[PDB]
Amino acid sequence: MDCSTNISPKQGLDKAKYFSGKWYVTHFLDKDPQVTDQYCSSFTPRESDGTVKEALYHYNANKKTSFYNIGEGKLESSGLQYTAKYKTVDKKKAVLKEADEKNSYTLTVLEADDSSALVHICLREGSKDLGDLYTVLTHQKDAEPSAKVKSAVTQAGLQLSQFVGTKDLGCQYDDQFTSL
Numbered sequence: 021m022d023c024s025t026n027i028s029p030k031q032g033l034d035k036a037k038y039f040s041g042k043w044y045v046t047h048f049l050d051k052d053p054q055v056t057d058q059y060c061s062s063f064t065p066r067e068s069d070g071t072v073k074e075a076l077y078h079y080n081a082n083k084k085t086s087f088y089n090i091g092e093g094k095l096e097s098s099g100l101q102y103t104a105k106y107k108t109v110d111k112k113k114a115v116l117k118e119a120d121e122k123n124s125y126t127l128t129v130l131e132a133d134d135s136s137a138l139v140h141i142c143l144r145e146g147s148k149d150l151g152d153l154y155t156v157l158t159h160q161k162d163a164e165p166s167a168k169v170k171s172a173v174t175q176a177g178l179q180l181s182q183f184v185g186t187k188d189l190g191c192q193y194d195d196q197f198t199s200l
């Protein structure tokens with residue numbers, strides 16, 4: 021699999037709108053999943069002096085378990101785009117597996133407004149692209165994405181209807197973990 025090539029951050033985006041509150045994924049478009057389980061996800065991104073730190077949560081909707089990470093990266097000169105290396109942690113943020121040099125993800129902000137966002141994520145390990153994901157984000161579980169963000173999907177060359185909507189997955193979140 022190769023990650024999607026025509027991906028760059030939207031210029032003129034206000035980063036105060038992206039690095040704010042917490043995000044819940046309402047819709048995801050996964051190009052070539054290596055597993056068949058469907059996930060829900062929430063995360064809390066913060067930025068300081070061009071360094072991004074984000075608490076990340078995944079819920080396996082099939083098995084009904086969840087895992088936790090902390091991503092850390094630098095902002096590109098391009099705008100709201102960053103490559104993050106990532107710690108694996110328990111629900112209390114104790115560090116399990118250290119962040120290394122060969123596993124990373126690149127996140128690109130395609131749109132962001134007061135309620136909603138669209139982001140693209142390329143997951144890599146070494147020389148291999150492992151995941152290519154577009155996610156629609158909102159600030160509360162099961163809030164409706166904004167008209168501006170639905171527009172950005174169509175502008176990215178995609179069909180929102182082709183995304184998996186997470187409302188139907190029976191998602192469970194851990195809001196204590198994502199606080200901070």
Ligand code: HEM
Nearest residue numbers: 045048055058059060061063076089106108125127141155
């Ligand atoms: C609903 C949205 C999402 C889905 C469906 C999804 C799906 C997946 C899947 C299937 C895996 C493989 C897990 C495994 O079997 O080991 C994974 C891993 C991962 N995802 Fe997500 N993901 C979502 C959102 C995100 C977001 C928003 C981020 C980062 C901001 C992200 C970053 C990662 C990272 C860093 C890993 C690797 C963790 C590890 O290897 O321990 N994902 N994701």
